[PDB]
């Protein structure tokens, strides 16, 4: 039969295309298929009753509008309860919640506040009297709070003022330049209070306490590591910060044995002198030797379009190799976080691949370069895909037009992470796993995709091969517990 | 170290060597034009990256059109022989202005405001139109009783055109903009299907596409339903011969033109019975008119409507036959953001049915194996940038889903879907967006020339015709290089 022969050739063709996607080799137990069919049901319900009933597919909307919807979906609770592996792309000063800074930090002593000339609130700590500036009229948060009338209103205005999701960012800061302006204001509002050593040591623990409470067991954080200041005025160095994080991490691992651990990546800004960037590469070289397991490598952060390139820093980033004997400072570069093509920003991909990076951040413009894409696969370089950030920071509006979706469908080395979840009031990793589930994979791909993501966060991490084996075991143990309790609570008895 | 710099430059030359047109060798005259385009291209790219301002080439076409018409590069492209336009829809391939200044000034034309506050036009030579949900009035009378004849004839365009308001702000959802897009055609159906008015609109198409230095067109048409003043409704072969007569008068008047060929189009919301009859009419028209008739295609919005598999019994009929026949196909496919859906999987049906070209193919990059097979078989994709933005597949054109494929020499051609619906040029406005949004900062004229040559290689002409068509383009192309360089280079 001509129809029968056609349908056989068609099914072979489609199944040969779908056999090359990410997670196509995950074989699920019948118990795991129960969860898979619960997720695929709601996924297909929203996909199909939005395609045919001709309505908006809320999972792909602005996170201001989708968050309330996502927080009422039965699948988001499954992901909330899922051991997601590791979050491999984080920035320290925005990986915990603003409510802790409003409720804990701004209730401490010696906390002043002021409204800058842009009508934004700023916070700082000064134990040496009133703060020394007059572009701002600093007042004590303690007194200004009591003299209001409704303390909760004072503490809600504080959060609304320093959050980016108090208004729809795609409407309040419509241009990429504007949203990066509000994004930069966010950090300047909090710098005077997050770099005080007592507040920072407690803030970092809040990161670990929250990321485990979202069933994430491993984190690789990027930090400036220097500038922690005390009440007496003393400002510390970088090695102080690394050991402050190392002390909190080990107290945590001892307290919670289900956690895998944390590791640190030093970050420098893209707009600072080549002299300082070499100075920081030197700090990373020594810190990597002194702390071989807690310290991973170096990265340059900050807005990628209007600031410098990776070639502008070649004398520094090649310094570890010209040494005799040659040294290896591992790199974790941001690269190609742009819509531009065949430009400096787009071409930072080649420099990162030739500087032998271990993972690439964002990598939005990798698909635009055929050979660059092939080479990264051959060498094993994985891309850290951060979906929600790529929407708010203005690389795409509909997440379904993400530039790495084609790569996911060809089993490309990829992991999923957030970037600065606390700025836009997002969950540690659940909200970004959900967006990938509904916007970055197909209608016939739910749990094979998610499980491969968790496994790739361990395979393409910076742990030793010995650690990675011992890390998957802990994740496996918690994963089977997650399948067991979920299926027990859904399947009839 | 210089050693690192050598490895870096080798890698870039290894990647960029795979772009579309990377093997085009430009004459020294052609290189001057390439440099004039690249100069303005990089200035606008780098002013926006560093001063942190908006890159208008990638904005909504409502806001970029005014800017584009004051750029020195658009005039260079306006003067370029672009080859062939291979994805056109007849009812929107000529200006709305022609309908207001010619058509609504003919006799027996009535107008009315429908229940949605949109204008509708129709022709009835037998008195007032046969409907009463609208109070039909003579366009002459409503135009006369207005205090300004120009205001009425500008409102007549403003209340039936899609670029009168920013489509991305007033009709923000895919449902809403496609609603206005469908309303556009229902506004004009009563006047574009009158046999005299349609025959002249098609003439306007060929004149307008030639006046934009496009030498060949492959237009998709319903081809049936042309009505006369008495009411006679015609068949498809009448339409095909109506187009064929006008085309051959055109080819004789302007011997610099290459020609035109026709593809039959059916809608995605009609019964399998109706689509089967259309497939049968297409088979016979292919035999009867072997040079002017090419094949069949199914059009209309792809997301809420049917698939190509729901019509398999019809589209295999040419093959289940003794002796077997081959009806060529020109399917639309995967004009969607969805992944692993019925819409998205229409590519497997198209590739197995030996389609000659695919329309849009926005989700072809999401399917690894589907892409490779089309490359071996020679199936090319018709990329329409401005269509995909206004109709809500992408907002920033630089996020177009086919940019990666262009960078690995994938067989592609460029066209405008419905240039008159959104007040765009025949082919220049869609070429400019490709130049500024779909390729890199270091690629201007090699890419454009390869597109012009691809419209002839990946056309439906015979191997004999293609050779004589390339020659006609070649002669016109070199005169374009000479005159353009003569007007820019010093003496
Ligand atoms: C703009 O920033 O950049 C141009 C080069 O990128 C430069 O010539 C121009 O002066 C800048 N625009 C201003 C300052 O308006
Ligand atoms: C019509 O505009 O254009 C025709 C050619 O397509 C021409 O014959 C006719 O005279 C024009 N009519 C008017 C009213 O301008
Ligand atoms: C006069 C007035 O309404 N001022 C508010 C200010 O209190 C608030 O801190 C700020 C947050 O951006 O928004 C301004 O509109
Ligand atoms: C340090 C650096 O940038 N690159 C080195 C490179 O010199 C060497 O050829 C390669 C061998 O695998 O190892 C990389 O780490
Ligand atoms: C805030 O946090 C630290 C631990 O995070 C805790 O010891 C301290 O008592 C808390 N402070 C307030 C004011 O609640
Ligand atoms: C003209 O149509 C527009 C939309 O194009 C609509 O707002 C308006 O109602 C119409 N004109 C009048 C005077 O009502
Ligand atoms: Zn980052
Ligand atoms: Zn079309």
d(CA A85, CA B275): 52
**Burial label, B54 (beta-carbon count in 10 A; 0-12, 13-18, 19+):** middle
CA dihedral of A435, A439, A444, A447, whole degrees rounded to 10: -20
The candidate with the shortest Cα–Cα distance to B190, out of B299, B93, B99, is B99
In angstroms, the separation between the Cα of residue A403 and the nearest Cα of chain B is: 7
B332 in the same domain as B267: yes
The neighbouring-strand residues paired with A268 are: A300
Out of A51, A56, A341, the one facing B341 most closely (by C-beta) is A51
Which chain B residues are Cβ-neighbours of A444 within 8 angstroms?
340
Instruction: Please report the residues numbered 7 through 66 in chain B whose beta carbons come closer than 8 angstroms to any beta carbon of chain A.
Output: 7-8, 11-12, 14-16, 18, 45, 49-50, 52-54, 58
Positive or negative: CA dihedral B337, B343, B348, B354? negative
Angle between helices A238-255 and A274-290 (to 10 degrees): 40
8 A C-beta contact, residue B404 and residue B352: no
Spatial CB neighbours of B439, under 8 Å, sequence gap ≥ 6: A341, A342, B19, B20, B403, B406, B407, B447
A104 in the same domain as A90: no
- Is residue B454 domain-resident? yes
Question: In the 3-class helix/strand/coil scheme, how is chain A assigned residue by residue?
Answer: CHHHHHHHHHHHHHHHHHCCCCCCCCCCCHHHHHHHHHHHHHHHHHHHHHHCCCCCCHHHCCHHHHHHHHCCCHHHHHHHCCCCCEEEEEEHHHCCCHHHHHHCHHHCCCEEEEECCCCCEEEEECCCCCCCCCCCCCEEHHHHHHCCCCHHHHHHHHHHHHCCCCCCHHHHCCCHHHHHHHHHHHHHHHHHHHCEHHHHHHHHHHHHHHHHHCCCCEEEEEECCCCCECCCCCECCHHHHHHHHHHHHHHHHHHCCCCCEEEEEEEEECCCCHHHHHHHHHHHHHHHHHCCCCEEEEEEECCCCCCCCCHHHHHHHCHHHHCCCCCCCCECCEECCCCCCCCHHHHHHHHHHHCCCCEEEECCCCCCCHHHHHHHHHHCCEEEECHHHHHHCCCCCCHHHCCCHHHHCCCCCEEECCCCCCCCCCCCCHHHHHHHHHHHCCCCCCHHHHHHHHHHHHHCCCCCHHHHHHHHHHHHHHHHHHHHHHHHHHCCC
Tell me which of A149, A179, A209 is where a domain ends. Answer: A179
CA of A120 to the centre of ligand 3 (A): 7
At residue A230's C-alpha, the angle toward residues A225 and A233, to 5°, is 110
**Ligand of minimum distance to the alpha carbon of B101:** 2
- Is residue A435 domain-resident? yes
Which chain B residues are Cβ-neighbours of A48 within 8 angstroms?
341
Count of beta carbons in the 10 Å neighbourhood of residue B288: 11
The neighbouring-strand residues paired with B298 are: B266
The finding on whether A355 has its CB within 6 A of some atom of ligand 4 is yes
Q: Give the DSSP H/E element, type plus range, for residue B455.
A: helix B445-457
The answer to whether the Cβ–Cβ distance between B395 and A400 falls below 8 Å is no
The finding on whether B102 has its CB within 6 A of some atom of ligand 2 is yes
In angstroms, the separation between the Cα of residue A444 and the nearest Cα of chain B is: 6
The candidate with the shortest Cα–Cα distance to A163, out of A180, A143, A135, A187, is A187
The finding on whether A119 has its CB within 6 A of some atom of ligand 3 is yes
Name the token pair of B222. Answer: 């319903």
Helix (H, G, I), strand (E, B) or coil at B475: helix
Name the closest-CA residue to atom 8, ligand 5.
Answer: A104
The minimum-distance atom of ligand 6 relative to the CA of B155 is 1
Angle between helices A197-213 and A176-194 (to 10 degrees): 120
- The one-character DSSP state at B434 is I
Which experiment gave this structure? Answer: X-ray
Name the token pair of A461. Answer: 């991490």
8 A C-beta contact, residue A460 and residue A416: no
Distances (CA, A) of B65 to B96, B112, B433: 17, 30, 10
The candidate with the shortest Cα–Cα distance to B84, out of B452, B467, B399, is B452
Tell whether B322 lies on the interface with A, counting CB pairs under 8 A.
no
Helix (H, G, I), strand (E, B) or coil at B194: strand
Out of A177, A318, A445, the one facing B4 most closely (by C-beta) is A318
8 A C-beta contact, residue B62 and residue B167: yes
Which chain A residues are Cβ-neighbours of B395 within 8 angstroms?
397-398
What backbone phi and psi angles, to 5 degrees, belong to B95? Answer: -70, 145
Nearest residue on chain B to A395, judged by CA atoms? B399
d(CA B10, CA B19): 15
- Is residue A53 domain-resident? no
As for how many domains chain B has, the answer is: 2
The neighbouring-strand residues paired with B260 are: B217
Total residues belonging to chain A: 493
Tokens 């398999």 — which residue? B312
A270 in the same domain as A145: no
d(CA A281, CA A174): 36
In angstroms, the separation between the Cα of residue B283 and the nearest Cα of chain A is: 19
8 A C-beta contact, residue B83 and residue B453: yes
CA of A90 to the centre of ligand 7 (A): 7
Q: Give the DSSP H/E element, type plus range, for residue B65.
A: helix B61-68
The answer to whether the Cβ–Cβ distance between A401 and B394 falls below 8 Å is yes
A162 in the same domain as A287: no
CA of B160 to the centre of ligand 6 (A): 10
CATH of the domain at B364: 3.20.20.140
Out of B14, B303, B368, the one facing A409 most closely (by C-beta) is B368
Tokens 């692993």 — which residue? B340
8 A C-beta contact, residue B86 and residue B413: yes
Cis check for the bond before B323: say yes or no (omega within 30 of 0).
yes
Per the annotation, where are the binding residues of B for Zn(2+)? 87, 89, 332, 417
Name the token pair of B92. Answer: 């929107």
CA of A119 to the centre of ligand 3 (A): 6
- Domain extent for A284: 80-98+194-477
Helix (H, G, I), strand (E, B) or coil at B466: helix
Q: Are strands A414-416 and A382-385 parallel, antiparallel or unpaired?
A: parallel
Name the token pair of B204. Answer: 């306007």
8 A C-beta contact, residue A179 and residue A169: yes
8 A C-beta contact, residue A487 and residue A31: yes
Q: Ligand 4 pocket check: which of A356, A358, A379 to mutate, most ligand atoms within 8 Å of Cβ? A: A356
Which among B22, B272, B343, B368 is the top mutation candidate for probing chain A, defined by the most A β-carbons within 10 Å of its own β-carbon? Answer: B368
8 A C-beta contact, residue B205 and residue B90: yes
Helix (H, G, I), strand (E, B) or coil at B318: coil
A238 in the same domain as A169: no
Out of B14, B369, B396, the one facing A371 most closely (by C-beta) is B14
Name the closest-CA residue to atom 9, ligand 2.
Answer: B102
Tokens 């095909």 — which residue? B240
8 A C-beta contact, residue B429 and residue B38: no
The finding on whether B199 has its CB within 6 A of some atom of ligand 2 is no
A425 among known catalytic residues: no
- Is residue B66 domain-resident? no
The minimum-distance atom of ligand 5 relative to the CA of A105 is 13
Resolution (A): 3.0
Spatial CB neighbours of B16, under 8 Å, sequence gap ≥ 6: A342, B22, B440, B442
In the set A337, A384, A425, A431, the catalytic residue is A337
Which chain B residues are Cβ-neighbours of A306 within 8 angstroms?
49-50, 52
d(CA B196, CA B227): 9
In angstroms, the separation between the Cα of residue A412 and the nearest Cα of chain B is: 12
B208 in the same domain as B146: no
Q: Give the DSSP H/E element, type plus range, for residue B84.
A: strand B84-89
- Is residue B481 domain-resident? no
**Burial label, B188 (beta-carbon count in 10 A; 0-12, 13-18, 19+):** buried
**Burial label, A72 (beta-carbon count in 10 A; 0-12, 13-18, 19+):** exposed
What backbone phi and psi angles, to 5 degrees, belong to A90? Answer: -135, 155
Per the annotation, where are the binding residues of A for Zn(2+)? 89, 91, 334, 419
How is chain B split among helix, strand and coil, in percent rounded to 5? 50, 10, 40
A385 in the same domain as A238: yes
The candidate with the shortest Cα–Cα distance to A374, out of A342, A399, A407, A352, is A407
- Is residue B26 domain-resident? no
Name the token pair of B281. Answer: 């009419």
Spatial CB neighbours of B41, under 8 Å, sequence gap ≥ 6: B73, B435, B436, B441, B444
- Is residue A69 domain-resident? no
8 A C-beta contact, residue A12 and residue B373: no
At residue B109's C-alpha, the angle toward residues B103 and B113, to 5°, is 105
The finding on whether B105 has its CB within 6 A of some atom of ligand 2 is yes
- Is residue A257 domain-resident? yes
Q: After which residues is chain A broken (C to N over 2.5 A)?
A: none
The answer to whether the Cβ–Cβ distance between A372 and B440 falls below 8 Å is no
CA dihedral of B384, B387, B390, B392, whole degrees rounded to 10: -80
Tell whether B166 lies on the interface with A, counting CB pairs under 8 A.
no
The candidate with the shortest Cα–Cα distance to A486, out of A6, A17, A29, is A29
In the set A362, A369, A402, A431, the catalytic residue is A362
B104 in the same domain as B84: no
B218 in the same domain as B166: no
The minimum-distance atom of ligand 6 relative to the CA of B113 is 10
The neighbouring-strand residues paired with B358 are: B381
d(CA B426, CA B419): 6
Name the closest-CA residue to atom 15, ligand 3.
Answer: A119
The finding on whether B159 has its CB within 6 A of some atom of ligand 6 is yes
B378 in the same domain as B281: yes
CA of A268 to the centre of ligand 7 (A): 11
d(CA B444, CA B35): 8
Angle between helices A447-459 and A465-490 (to 10 degrees): 160
The neighbouring-strand residues paired with B234 are: none
Tell whether A318 lies on the interface with B, counting CB pairs under 8 A.
yes
B367 among known catalytic residues: no
B450 in the same domain as B314: yes
B149 in the same domain as B85: no
């Amino acid at each position: 039969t001509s129809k029968a022969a056609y349908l056989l050739k068609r099914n072979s063709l489609i199944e040969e295309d779908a056999s090359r996607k990410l997670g196509a080799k995950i074989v699920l137990t019948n118990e795991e298929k129960v969860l898979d069919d619960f997720i695929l049901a709601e996924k297909r319900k929203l996909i199909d009753d939005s395609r045919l009933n001709q309505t908006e597919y809320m999972p792909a909307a602005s996170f201001y509008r989708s968050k309330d919807f996502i927080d009422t979906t039965f699948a988001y609770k499954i992901i909330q309860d899922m051991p997601k592996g590791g979050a491999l792309h984080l920035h320290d000063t925005a990986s915990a919640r603003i409510d802790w800074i409003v409720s804990n930090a701004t209730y401490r002593d010696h906390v002043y506040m002021c409204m800058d000339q842009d009508n934004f609130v700023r916070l700082t700590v000064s134990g040496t009297g009133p703060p020394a500036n007059s572009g701002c009229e600093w007042k004590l948060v303690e007194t200004e709070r009591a003299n209001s009338g409704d303390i909760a209103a004072f503490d809600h205005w504080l959060k609304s003022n320093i959050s980016l999701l108090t208004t729809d960012p795609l409407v309040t800061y419509p241009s990429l330049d504007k949203v990066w302006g509000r994004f930069d204001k966010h950090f300047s509002q909090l710098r005077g209070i997050i770099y005080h050593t007592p507040i920072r040591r407690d803030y970092y623990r809040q990161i670990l306490e929250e990321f485990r409470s979202d069933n994430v067991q491993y984190v690789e954080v990027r930090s400036s590591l220097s500038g922690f200041f005390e009440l007496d005025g003393t400002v510390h160095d970088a090695e102080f910060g690394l050991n402050l994080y190392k002390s909190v991490t080990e107290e945590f691992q001892r307290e919670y044995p289900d956690f895998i651990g944390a590791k640190i990546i030093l970050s420098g800004l893209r707009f600072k002198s080549q002299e300082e960037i070499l100075n920081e590469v030197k700090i990373a070289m020594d810190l990597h030797k002194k702390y071989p397991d807690f310290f991973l490598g170096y990265d340059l952060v900050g807005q990628e379009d209007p600031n410098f390139s990776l070639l502008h820093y070649l004398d520094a980033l090649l310094y570890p190799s010209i040494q005799n004997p040659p040294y290896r400072l591992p790199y974790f570069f941001h690269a190609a976080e742009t819509n531009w093509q065949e430009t400096e920003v787009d071409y930072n991909l080649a420099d990162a691949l030739l500087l032998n990076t271990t993972r690439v951040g964002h990598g939005f413009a990798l698909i635009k370069h055929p050979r660059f894409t092939e080479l990264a696969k051959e060498n094993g370089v994985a891309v850290e895909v951060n979906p929600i950030s790529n929407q708010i920071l203005g690389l795409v509006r509909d997440v379904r037009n993400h530039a790495l979706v084609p790569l996911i469908a060809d089993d490309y080395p990829i992991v999923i992470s957030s970037d600065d979840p606390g700025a836009w009031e997002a969950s540690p990793l659940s909200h970004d796993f959900y967006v990938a589930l509904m916007d970055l994979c197909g209608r016939d791909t739910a749990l094979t995709f998610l499980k491969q993501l968790a496994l790739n966060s361990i395979r393409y991490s910076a742990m030793s091969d010995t650690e990675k084996v011992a890390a998957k075991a802990k994740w496996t143990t918690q994963w089977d517990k997650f399948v067991k309790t979920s299926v027990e609570g859904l399947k009839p008895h």
